[PDB]
Amino acid sequence: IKSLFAVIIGGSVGCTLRWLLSTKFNSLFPNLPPGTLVVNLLAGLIIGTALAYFLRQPHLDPFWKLMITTGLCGGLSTFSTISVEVFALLQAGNYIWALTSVLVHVIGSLIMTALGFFIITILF
Amino acid sequence: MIKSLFAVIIGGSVGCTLRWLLSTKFNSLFPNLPPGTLVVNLLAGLIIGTALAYFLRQPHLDPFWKLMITTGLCGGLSTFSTISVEVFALLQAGNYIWALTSVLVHVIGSLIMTALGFFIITILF
Amino acid sequence: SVSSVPTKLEVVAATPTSLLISWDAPAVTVVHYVITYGETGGNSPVQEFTVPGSKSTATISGLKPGVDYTITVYTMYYSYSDLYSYSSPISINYRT
Amino acid sequence: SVSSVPTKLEVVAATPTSLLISWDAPAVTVVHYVITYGETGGNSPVQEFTVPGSKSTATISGLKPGVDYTITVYTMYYSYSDLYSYSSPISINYRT
Ligand SMILES: CCCCCCCCCCO[C@@H]1O[C@H](CO)[C@@H](O[C@H]2O[C@H](CO)[C@@H](O)[C@H](O)[C@H]2O)[C@H](O)[C@H]1O
Ligand SMILES: CCCCCCCCCCO[C@@H]1O[C@H](CO)[C@@H](O[C@H]2O[C@H](CO)[C@@H](O)[C@H](O)[C@H]2O)[C@H](O)[C@H]1O
Ligand SMILES: CCCCCCCCCCO[C@@H]1O[C@H](CO)[C@@H](O[C@H]2O[C@H](CO)[C@@H](O)[C@H](O)[C@H]2O)[C@H](O)[C@H]1O
Ligand SMILES: [F-]
Ligand SMILES: [F-]
Ligand code: NA
Fold it and tell me: What is d(CA D80, CA A73) in angstroms, rounded to the nearest whole number?
């Protein structure tokens, strides 16, 4: 139940952030909506830094890392929204941007995870 | 935009909670492609596909309910960051085959589920 | 925030029994356009057909010479908030 | 739920000054194994090195002949709940 509050507090903060950023910026570039991209790049970065940080601090409370990973990053990031954006592009016959969106999200999110991990490991 | 905030939080908290339960339950069963994380993304893919078809046919449905289902439930339920860290770990472990496979199964799988949800409801109505 | 309705709907070319129409795409992901046409002032069934989202022109054939037609174009489009929905129409009159 | 500790740690081959050890991987994503070794007798400094996650054997060189060594292996592993963390060790004794 203490663990449930971590997921809900973290998740609600993340979901709220995703909502604000997406409704703000997605309509600016419809072929690859940048609000949805930024939230995934940002969660990629955060969880990368979490990866490195929590390794070096083995005794940190499981409540905080549950709040950051399952909660914040889990709420902030999204797969379903990419799925529906891409599906729509596919229905629209816009295959180039369908493919590009998938690649930019995957490669971009992995680069951000790597960058967050390596900045913190190179910092220690 | 406060009634709208409750939709995101109620939907999101339900989705996040579901993802937590399913992932902690099933992810350790197959570590090369953790099935809890996959199922939540396949499930959200399905739900939003059916939402796509259903909302089109019901233009007058309250924006509160579709905000709760899409940004809330599907947004909370699905995850990209967890795939990113699973794949990153596989890459660090030198397990490139399953790193690539995980990316492909998540993407193609989620799109198939979105299509299936959309077309079941359009073929139904 | 952003209009999903096309702009500058116009007849670019015409014969007595057909019309080539074009429009400017709205700044949203259009999955398809729906073209409607029928005789102005009613007294004839309105017909419609779709064109893919990539296209921004359409041919309307089988019309009658010297008759006023009401022609409309709307989109079925993806946006973040509403998923798939239909835009309002843009509408012109044109006499063959 | 699932053990991140390796099993069946053993010396598969030996010379007077080296040991080839092997172990069975645990059923989790191991990023790397950490091998430690030191003289069982007294307080010689324990040394350690990593091996990649794909490997499940390691060579320990530069040992002294006829001396008992304590050898341990643990994992740095990815799981869902704890992200990257370190397992408990598995441990054997072996006399060169
Ligand atoms: C990548 C992993 C696999 C995931 C699964 C994805 C499933 C893809 C669904 C595609 O949906 C179809 O796309 C066609 C083309 O995009 C559309 O055709 C439309 O557009 C065509 C050309 O643009 C025309 O020829 C058609 O007549 C017209 O209906 C058609 O309506 C639509 O239902
Ligand atoms: C898809 C495009 C975007 C991708 C984003 C970037 C992600 C790449 C992560 C790379 O991480 C490295 O992975 C190596 C293994 O793959 C590890 O090498 C380890 O394992 C090797 C063999 O498996 C040994 O040769 C090395 O010495 C040993 O350090 C190394 O430590 C680790 O930092
Ligand atoms: C030009 C100046 C650059 C900045 C200088 C920093 C150099 C040392 C820290 C970075 O090391 C990288 O990342 C891992 C460490 O973070 C190393 O993997 C090593 O350590 C890992 C655990 O930390 C193990 O998994 C691997 O097997 C083992 O090879 C890996 O080889 C190396 O690429
Ligand atoms: F999804
Ligand atoms: F991400
Ligand atoms: Na999410």
Answer: 13
| Beta-carbon count within 10 A of C45 CB | 7
Name residues whose C-beta falls within 8 Å of residue A46's C-beta, 6 or more positions apart in sequence. Answer: A68, A72, A73, A76, A116, B81
B51 to each of A75, B35, B45, B122, C79, how far by Cα in Å?
A: 19, 24, 10, 11, 13
> Is C37 within 8 Å of C71 (Cβ atoms)?
yes
CB-CB under 8 Å, D83 with A69:
yes
Contact yes or no, A with C (3+ CB pairs under 8 Å)? yes
Give the residue from C93, C82, C84, C90 showing the smallest Cα distance to C25.
C90
CA distances in angstroms from A10 to A39, A72, B86, listed in the order given: 14, 4, 20
Residue D83 distance to chain A (closest CA, Å): 6
Q: Which of A19, A20, A23, A27 has the most C C-beta neighbours within 10 Å, making it the best mutation to test the interface with C?
A: A27
Main-chain dihedrals φ then ψ at residue D50, nearest 5 degrees: -100, 155
Closest CA to B19 of B4, B31, B33, B34: B34
Q: Looking at residue D86, what DSSP letter applies? A: E
Pairs of residues, one from chain A and one from chain C, whose beta carbons lie less than 8 Å apart: 47
Domain residue spans of chain A: 1-124
Q: Which of D33, D16, D14, D15 is nearest to D24 (CA)?
A: D33
User: Which residue's alpha carbon is at the smallest distance from atom 27 of ligand 3?
Assistant: D52
Count of domains observed in chain C: 1
How many C-beta atoms surround the C-beta of residue D95 within 10 A?
A: 11
Structure tokens at A39: 């939230």
For chain C, helix (H) and strand (E) counts, in that order, are 0, 8
Mutation choice for D interface testing from A3, A55, A59 by most D CBs within 10 A: A55
CA distance A22 to A28: 10
Q: Give the method of determination.
A: X-ray
Residue D28 in contact with partner chain B when CB distance is under 8 A = yes
Residue numbers preceding breaks in chain D (C to N > 2.5 A): none
Who's near B105: CB < 8 A, 6+ residues apart? B33, B38
Cα separation, B17 vs B15, in Å, equals 5
Tell me the residue range of the domain where C85 lies.
1-96
For atom 29 of ligand 1, the residue with the nearest CA is C52
Contact A66 D76 (CB under 8 A): no
Helices (H) and strands (E) in chain A, counts: 6, 0
State the CATH number of the domain containing residue D80. Answer: 2.60.40.10
